[PDB]
PDB file of C-alpha atoms and ligand atoms in Angstrom:
ATOM      1  CA  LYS P   1      89.113  78.820 114.799  1.00 31.07           C
ATOM      2  CA  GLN P   2      87.954  80.628 111.912  1.00 29.47           C
ATOM      3  CA  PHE P   3      87.756  80.191 108.172  1.00 27.82           C
ATOM      4  CA  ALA P   4      87.831  82.162 105.341  1.00 25.82           C
ATOM      5  CA  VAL P   5      87.619  81.045 101.664  1.00 25.05           C
ATOM      6  CA  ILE P   6      88.413  83.456  99.103  1.00 25.04           C
ATOM      7  CA  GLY P   7      86.735  82.409  95.682  1.00 22.71           C
ATOM      8  CA  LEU P   8      83.535  80.674  94.930  1.00 22.02           C
ATOM      9  CA  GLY P   9      84.181  78.616  92.201  1.00 23.13           C
ATOM     10  CA  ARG P  10      83.109  74.771  91.850  1.00 22.00           C
ATOM     11  CA  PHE P  11      86.264  74.209  94.815  1.00 21.07           C
ATOM     12  CA  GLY P  12      85.797  77.071  96.679  1.00 20.85           C
ATOM     13  CA  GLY P  13      82.193  77.389  96.877  1.00 19.65           C
ATOM     14  CA  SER P  14      81.962  73.725  97.618  1.00 20.22           C
ATOM     15  CA  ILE P  15      84.479  73.891 100.658  1.00 22.27           C
ATOM     16  CA  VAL P  16      82.127  76.652 101.834  1.00 20.14           C
ATOM     17  CA  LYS P  17      79.068  74.619 101.504  1.00 16.66           C
ATOM     18  CA  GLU P  18      80.722  71.762 103.284  1.00 18.28           C
ATOM     19  CA  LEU P  19      82.022  73.808 106.563  1.00 18.72           C
ATOM     20  CA  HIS P  20      78.639  75.008 106.752  1.00 19.94           C
ATOM     21  CA  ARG P  21      77.035  71.536 106.336  1.00 19.23           C
ATOM     22  CA  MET P  22      79.652  70.587 109.196  1.00 20.65           C
ATOM     23  CA  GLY P  23      78.495  73.130 111.438  1.00 20.43           C
ATOM     24  CA  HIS P  24      81.481  75.598 111.424  1.00 18.66           C
ATOM     25  CA  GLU P  25      81.406  79.392 110.635  1.00 15.58           C
ATOM     26  CA  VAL P  26      82.828  80.496 107.255  1.00 15.38           C
ATOM     27  CA  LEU P  27      83.620  84.123 105.661  1.00 11.99           C
ATOM     28  CA  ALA P  28      83.022  83.710 102.235  1.00 13.90           C
ATOM     29  CA  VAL P  29      84.401  86.485  99.796  1.00 11.27           C
ATOM     30  CA  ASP P  30      84.464  86.903  96.087  1.00 11.58           C
ATOM     31  CA  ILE P  31      84.387  89.815  93.689  1.00  8.40           C
ATOM     32  CA  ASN P  32      81.035  89.563  91.673  1.00  8.63           C
ATOM     33  CA  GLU P  33      78.120  89.660  93.982  1.00  9.24           C
ATOM     34  CA  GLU P  34      76.268  86.553  91.729  1.00 10.15           C
ATOM     35  CA  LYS P  35      78.930  84.383  93.215  1.00  6.15           C
ATOM     36  CA  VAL P  36      78.377  86.105  96.915  1.00  3.12           C
ATOM     37  CA  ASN P  37      74.987  86.061  96.410  1.00  2.00           C
ATOM     38  CA  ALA P  38      74.806  82.251  95.477  1.00  2.00           C
ATOM     39  CA  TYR P  39      76.162  81.275  98.985  1.00  2.00           C
ATOM     40  CA  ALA P  40      74.822  83.691 101.203  1.00  2.00           C
ATOM     41  CA  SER P  41      72.657  81.159 102.457  1.00  2.00           C
ATOM     42  CA  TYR P  42      75.769  78.843 103.358  1.00  2.00           C
ATOM     43  CA  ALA P  43      78.034  81.441 104.886  1.00  2.00           C
ATOM     44  CA  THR P  44      78.196  82.602 108.246  1.00  2.00           C
ATOM     45  CA  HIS P  45      78.884  85.713 106.350  1.00  3.98           C
ATOM     46  CA  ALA P  46      79.393  86.124 102.366  1.00  2.00           C
ATOM     47  CA  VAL P  47      81.117  89.332 101.129  1.00  2.00           C
ATOM     48  CA  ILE P  48      81.773  91.412  97.805  1.00  2.00           C
ATOM     49  CA  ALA P  49      85.406  92.084  97.771  1.00  2.00           C
ATOM     50  CA  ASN P  50      88.435  92.017  95.456  1.00  2.00           C
ATOM     51  CA  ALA P  51      91.002  90.166  97.756  1.00  2.00           C
ATOM     52  CA  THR P  52      93.781  91.657  95.629  1.00  2.00           C
ATOM     53  CA  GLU P  53      93.331  94.948  97.185  1.00  2.00           C
ATOM     54  CA  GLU P  54      95.430  95.859 100.684  1.00  2.40           C
ATOM     55  CA  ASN P  55      92.121  98.154 101.696  1.00  3.11           C
ATOM     56  CA  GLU P  56      89.567  95.731 101.010  1.00  3.07           C
ATOM     57  CA  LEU P  57      91.071  92.924 103.148  1.00  2.66           C
ATOM     58  CA  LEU P  58      91.265  95.432 106.162  1.00  3.54           C
ATOM     59  CA  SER P  59      87.928  95.755 105.767  1.00  5.72           C
ATOM     60  CA  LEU P  60      87.299  92.369 105.520  1.00  4.91           C
ATOM     61  CA  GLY P  61      89.143  91.656 108.803  1.00  3.71           C
ATOM     62  CA  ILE P  62      90.948  88.802 107.586  1.00  4.68           C
ATOM     63  CA  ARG P  63      93.834  89.535 110.016  1.00  4.67           C
ATOM     64  CA  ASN P  64      91.845  87.310 112.312  1.00  5.18           C
ATOM     65  CA  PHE P  65      91.231  84.101 110.640  1.00  4.77           C
ATOM     66  CA  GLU P  66      93.655  81.080 111.652  1.00  4.87           C
ATOM     67  CA  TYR P  67      92.665  79.859 108.149  1.00  5.68           C
ATOM     68  CA  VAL P  68      92.367  81.214 104.844  1.00  7.37           C
ATOM     69  CA  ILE P  69      92.015  79.534 101.342  1.00  3.38           C
ATOM     70  CA  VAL P  70      92.354  81.113  98.220  1.00  3.48           C
ATOM     71  CA  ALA P  71      90.208  79.351  95.961  1.00  2.00           C
ATOM     72  CA  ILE P  72      90.197  81.770  92.971  1.00  2.00           C
ATOM     73  CA  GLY P  73      90.457  80.613  89.646  1.00  6.61           C
ATOM     74  CA  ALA P  74      91.744  80.962  85.977  1.00  6.25           C
ATOM     75  CA  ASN P  75      93.283  84.178  87.601  1.00  4.30           C
ATOM     76  CA  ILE P  76      96.821  83.282  88.457  1.00  6.61           C
ATOM     77  CA  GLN P  77      98.057  86.683  89.714  1.00  6.51           C
ATOM     78  CA  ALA P  78      95.064  87.348  91.737  1.00  6.61           C
ATOM     79  CA  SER P  79      95.648  84.192  93.289  1.00  4.27           C
ATOM     80  CA  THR P  80      99.462  84.987  94.002  1.00  2.14           C
ATOM     81  CA  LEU P  81      99.286  88.828  94.658  1.00  4.47           C
ATOM     82  CA  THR P  82      96.367  87.444  97.177  1.00  2.74           C
ATOM     83  CA  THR P  83      98.276  84.773  98.859  1.00  3.04           C
ATOM     84  CA  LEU P  84     101.259  87.317  98.871  1.00  4.11           C
ATOM     85  CA  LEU P  85      99.427  90.005 100.485  1.00  4.64           C
ATOM     86  CA  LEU P  86      97.599  87.927 103.207  1.00  4.26           C
ATOM     87  CA  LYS P  87     101.201  86.380 103.578  1.00  4.80           C
ATOM     88  CA  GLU P  88     102.062  89.679 104.710  1.00  3.28           C
ATOM     89  CA  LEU P  89      98.988  89.892 107.251  1.00  2.00           C
ATOM     90  CA  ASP P  90     100.738  87.113 109.047  1.00  2.00           C
ATOM     91  CA  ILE P  91      98.082  84.455 108.644  1.00  2.00           C
ATOM     92  CA  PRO P  92      98.881  81.404 110.571  1.00  2.00           C
ATOM     93  CA  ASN P  93      97.607  79.198 107.634  1.00  2.00           C
ATOM     94  CA  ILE P  94      96.757  80.018 103.854  1.00  2.00           C
ATOM     95  CA  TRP P  95      96.100  77.439 101.516  1.00  2.00           C
ATOM     96  CA  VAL P  96      96.065  78.144  98.142  1.00  2.00           C
ATOM     97  CA  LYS P  97      94.612  75.866  95.087  1.00  2.00           C
ATOM     98  CA  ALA P  98      96.944  76.051  92.061  1.00  2.00           C
ATOM     99  CA  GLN P  99      96.755  74.746  88.453  1.00  3.59           C
ATOM    100  CA  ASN P 100     100.514  75.397  87.436  1.00  2.00           C
ATOM    101  CA  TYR P 101     103.743  73.606  87.989  1.00  2.00           C
ATOM    102  CA  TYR P 102     104.814  77.364  87.731  1.00  2.00           C
ATOM    103  CA  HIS P 103     101.895  78.808  89.975  1.00  2.00           C
ATOM    104  CA  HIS P 104     102.731  75.783  92.330  1.00  2.00           C
ATOM    105  CA  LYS P 105     106.243  76.775  92.393  1.00  2.00           C
ATOM    106  CA  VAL P 106     105.932  80.005  93.141  1.00  3.13           C
ATOM    107  CA  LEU P 107     103.338  79.812  95.854  1.00  2.74           C
ATOM    108  CA  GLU P 108     105.797  76.985  97.244  1.00  2.00           C
ATOM    109  CA  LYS P 109     108.109  79.699  97.637  1.00  2.00           C
ATOM    110  CA  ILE P 110     105.878  82.651  98.529  1.00  2.00           C
ATOM    111  CA  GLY P 111     105.262  80.670 101.556  1.00  2.00           C
ATOM    112  CA  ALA P 112     101.983  79.093 101.090  1.00  2.00           C
ATOM    113  CA  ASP P 113     101.389  76.666 103.642  1.00  2.00           C
ATOM    114  CA  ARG P 114      99.383  74.252 101.458  1.00  2.00           C
ATOM    115  CA  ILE P 115      98.942  74.007  97.756  1.00  2.00           C
ATOM    116  CA  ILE P 116      96.393  72.147  96.231  1.00  2.79           C
ATOM    117  CA  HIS P 117      95.635  70.622  92.743  1.00  2.00           C
ATOM    118  CA  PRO P 118      92.066  69.190  93.030  1.00  3.85           C
ATOM    119  CA  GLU P 119      92.545  66.607  90.044  1.00  5.84           C
ATOM    120  CA  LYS P 120      95.907  65.642  91.013  1.00  9.06           C
ATOM    121  CA  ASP P 121      94.731  65.315  94.779  1.00 12.89           C
ATOM    122  CA  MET P 122      91.643  63.828  94.006  1.00 13.36           C
ATOM    123  CA  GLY P 123      93.532  61.088  91.782  1.00 14.45           C
ATOM    124  CA  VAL P 124      95.536  59.959  94.794  1.00 10.88           C
ATOM    125  CA  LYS P 125      92.351  60.084  97.200  1.00 12.61           C
ATOM    126  CA  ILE P 126      90.830  57.522  94.712  1.00 13.10           C
ATOM    127  CA  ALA P 127      93.513  55.313  93.975  1.00 13.26           C
ATOM    128  CA  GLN P 128      93.472  55.334  97.666  1.00 14.14           C
ATOM    129  CA  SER P 129      89.740  54.406  98.045  1.00 12.58           C
ATOM    130  CA  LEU P 130      89.989  51.653  95.217  1.00 12.82           C
ATOM    131  CA  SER P 131      92.699  49.905  97.819  1.00 12.93           C
ATOM    132  CA  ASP P 132      90.340  50.530 100.950  1.00  9.54           C
ATOM    133  CA  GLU P 133      87.708  48.857  98.833  1.00  8.54           C
ATOM    134  CA  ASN P 134      89.093  45.302  99.610  1.00  6.23           C
TER     135      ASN P 134
HETATM  136  N1  NAI E 201      93.138  78.156  91.726  1.00  5.04           N
HETATM  137  C1  NAI E 201      94.093  78.762  90.712  1.00  5.04           C
HETATM  138  O1  NAI E 201      95.130  79.779  90.792  1.00  5.04           O
HETATM  139  C2  NAI E 201      93.721  78.485  89.479  1.00  5.04           C
HETATM  140  C3  NAI E 201      93.066  77.820  88.844  1.00  5.04           C
HETATM  141  N2  NAI E 201      92.940  77.439  87.476  1.00  5.04           N
HETATM  142  C4  NAI E 201      92.138  76.814  86.965  1.00  5.04           C
HETATM  143  O2  NAI E 201      90.968  77.472  86.113  1.00  5.04           O
HETATM  144  C5  NAI E 201      89.826  76.816  86.308  1.00  5.04           C
HETATM  145  C6  NAI E 201      88.466  77.586  86.375  1.00  5.04           C
HETATM  146  O3  NAI E 201      88.354  77.400  87.795  1.00  5.04           O
HETATM  147  P1  NAI E 201      86.874  78.154  88.621  1.00  5.04           P
HETATM  148  O4  NAI E 201      87.175  78.000  89.956  1.00  5.04           O
HETATM  149  O5  NAI E 201      85.850  77.784  88.288  1.00  5.04           O
HETATM  150  O6  NAI E 201      87.504  79.598  87.949  1.00  5.04           O
HETATM  151  P2  NAI E 201      86.152  80.778  88.175  1.00  5.04           P
HETATM  152  O7  NAI E 201      86.895  81.768  87.101  1.00  5.04           O
HETATM  153  O8  NAI E 201      85.206  80.277  87.778  1.00  5.04           O
HETATM  154  O9  NAI E 201      86.186  81.176  89.510  1.00  5.04           O
HETATM  155  C7  NAI E 201      87.083  81.805  90.381  1.00  5.04           C
HETATM  156  C8  NAI E 201      86.490  82.462  91.254  1.00  5.04           C
HETATM  157  O10 NAI E 201      87.198  83.417  92.596  1.00  5.04           O
HETATM  158  C9  NAI E 201      86.317  84.719  92.299  1.00  5.04           C
HETATM  159  N3  NAI E 201      87.004  85.815  92.698  1.00  5.04           N
HETATM  160  C10 NAI E 201      87.011  86.384  94.192  1.00  5.04           C
HETATM  161  N4  NAI E 201      87.875  87.229  94.544  1.00  5.04           N
HETATM  162  C11 NAI E 201      88.413  87.399  93.402  1.00  5.04           C
HETATM  163  C12 NAI E 201      89.483  88.336  93.115  1.00  5.04           C
HETATM  164  N5  NAI E 201      90.127  89.270  93.827  1.00  5.04           N
HETATM  165  N6  NAI E 201      90.087  88.101  91.539  1.00  5.04           N
HETATM  166  C13 NAI E 201      89.576  87.223  90.912  1.00  5.04           C
HETATM  167  N7  NAI E 201      88.573  86.233  90.988  1.00  5.04           N
HETATM  168  C14 NAI E 201      88.094  86.608  92.485  1.00  5.04           C
HETATM  169  C15 NAI E 201      85.756  84.832  90.905  1.00  5.04           C
HETATM  170  O11 NAI E 201      85.034  85.866  90.971  1.00  5.04           O
HETATM  171  C16 NAI E 201      85.313  83.479  90.957  1.00  5.04           C
HETATM  172  O12 NAI E 201      83.973  82.969  91.526  1.00  5.04           O
HETATM  173  C17 NAI E 201      89.899  75.526  87.409  1.00  5.04           C
HETATM  174  O13 NAI E 201      89.612  74.207  87.471  1.00  5.04           O
HETATM  175  C18 NAI E 201      91.404  75.713  87.690  1.00  5.04           C
HETATM  176  O14 NAI E 201      92.110  74.263  87.749  1.00  5.04           O
HETATM  177  C19 NAI E 201      94.211  78.174  86.511  1.00  5.04           C
HETATM  178  C20 NAI E 201      94.877  79.061  87.129  1.00  5.04           C
HETATM  179  C21 NAI E 201      95.048  79.413  88.343  1.00  5.04           C
END
């Protein structure tokens, strides 16, 4: 029902723009307001928070998003700690972007419903499109 994207880089911000362009409402959170301000026009609600902190997550109300996406970047701990925190919030679905075989492997066992490798996955998606192209 609900969609929450944590981390507004090229990936996360993109998935926030699309869900908007598709007519869905999104909660878009990040730690530096520059980012939050950059998507205020696309998110049904854009907030400034540190998703690694227990309390900010409750003032976020994340407890009620069927889907949450951890699209944080070059910072692996925040990523996992965040996915770890909310994993304990009982979020039915948490998808996380990954960049490490290591990272992937921990997320895997932490209980992440879906791990994403933009580069690898986009890879298969294209080979896919090539075959389709005839
Ligand atoms: N998703 C991941 O865990 C990882 C990604 N990487 C790689 O790092 C590269 C850099 O990617 P970008 O998206 O451009 O990274 P980036 O540093 O530009 O953006 C990450 C975003 O998440 C935001 N954010 C929101 N809440 C945060 C919090 N509590 N702590 C930290 N950041 C928070 C940051 O402020 C920022 O906008 C990527 O291409 C990715 O492949 C490397 C390690 C982990």
